[PDB]
Design a protein around this ligand. Structure first.
Ligand SMILES: [Cl-]
Ligand SMILES: [Cl-]
Ligand SMILES: [Mg+2]
Ligand SMILES: [Mg+2]
Lengths: 195, 195
């Protein structure tokens, strides 16, 4: 079975994190949540005060064989990720070992750009943080999949469904992505993977 | 100054609960989460395994000053609500005292219909449970607001943004709903409260 490592830090965006986890589980993907930048504490207070319990400290799962590492947004959570040497090294290791990096909202600009992880990759993120992403790399699009570098990015709380569905498509296929999308009562405008 | 009591149970739908909480906080609404777990446990495992901490057991906060009571879906969470005499009494008290009841996905058919809390009024819920809503009450709309009985209902995980925005409209008004919507990068199929 496919698997995903979803990172959480103080100040992570809870709608982004939780919607993604839920969709991945609906897609049959095994999800582990990891606490980042908390010295092992598993209780994470998210950006609007929602309190989540992570499964494990990052340092205990960073070497696992997950197919994708997921970086939720939330400006303070993304800063924690950026400033965690373990988080940054783990993202680089996922990439170098042929796996997927997935990041939403503030995470592309705050984590990926300062560390030059994908120097010529195409990416999106929260629109009013556009200028934190190099102009030659920026696209203003609900989801961007750069297949060359296996980088999936997305824009905000309202694109979390689109983001999760594309992870499902990539790890377990279009039919499963459509099956999950069909469970949700999705808004018009969001791609449902039927075609 | 507006406030919302968001109920949580083992098996609640985490996207529905968390998206709603996040949006209400963005709207300036004070949110209290209440566990309906039969033992008073606050560390709730949701329908896809997300672990969410409730602020308080329902018995301690049910008599608080809250403008709306919110019932997330998730079939097992909704069954817990249905089978909790305190939950049912609290919903009835919100309604009889002129306050708002808000319910999504399985919660209308599982909680409201069997207890006959709203014998007259329009409502929606998850489409596969349509045949558990009385035919004269059912509408197939992303959100249904029946002001005659102050009943707000909605359909599924993918309508959680619509649902939260309508709570904001009802508690704080259209200007705040549009402000919050504008933050989200939400899909074109969700009403954005701008005219
Ligand atoms: Cl750690
Ligand atoms: Cl509609
Ligand atoms: Mg394909
Ligand atoms: Mg003003």
């Amino acid at each position: 079975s496919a698997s995903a490592l979803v990172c959480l830090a103080p100040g992570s965006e809870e709608t982004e994190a939780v919607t993604t986890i839920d969709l991945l589980v609906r897609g049959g993907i095994k999800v582990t949540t990891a606490s980042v930048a908390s010295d092992g504490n598993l209780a994470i207070t998210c950006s609007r005060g929602v309190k989540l319990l992570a499964d494990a400290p990052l340092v205990e799962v960073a070497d696992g064989e997950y197919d994708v590492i997921v970086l939720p947004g939330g400006i303070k959570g993304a800063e924690c990720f950026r400033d965690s040497t373990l988080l940054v090294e783990t993202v680089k290791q996922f990439h170098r070992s042929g796996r997927i990096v997935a990041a939403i909202c503030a995470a592309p600009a705050t984590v990926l750009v300062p560390h030059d992880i994908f120097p010529i990759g195409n990416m999106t993120g929260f629109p009013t943080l556009k200028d934190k992403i190099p102009a030659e790399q920026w696209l203003d699009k609900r989801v961007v999949w750069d297949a060359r570098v296996k980088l999936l990015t997305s824009q905000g709380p309202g694109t979390a469904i689109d983001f999760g569905l594309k992870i499902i498509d990539l790890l377990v296929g279009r039919e499963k992505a459509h099956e999950v999308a069909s469970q949700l009562v999705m808004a018009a405008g969001i791609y449902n993977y039927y075609e």
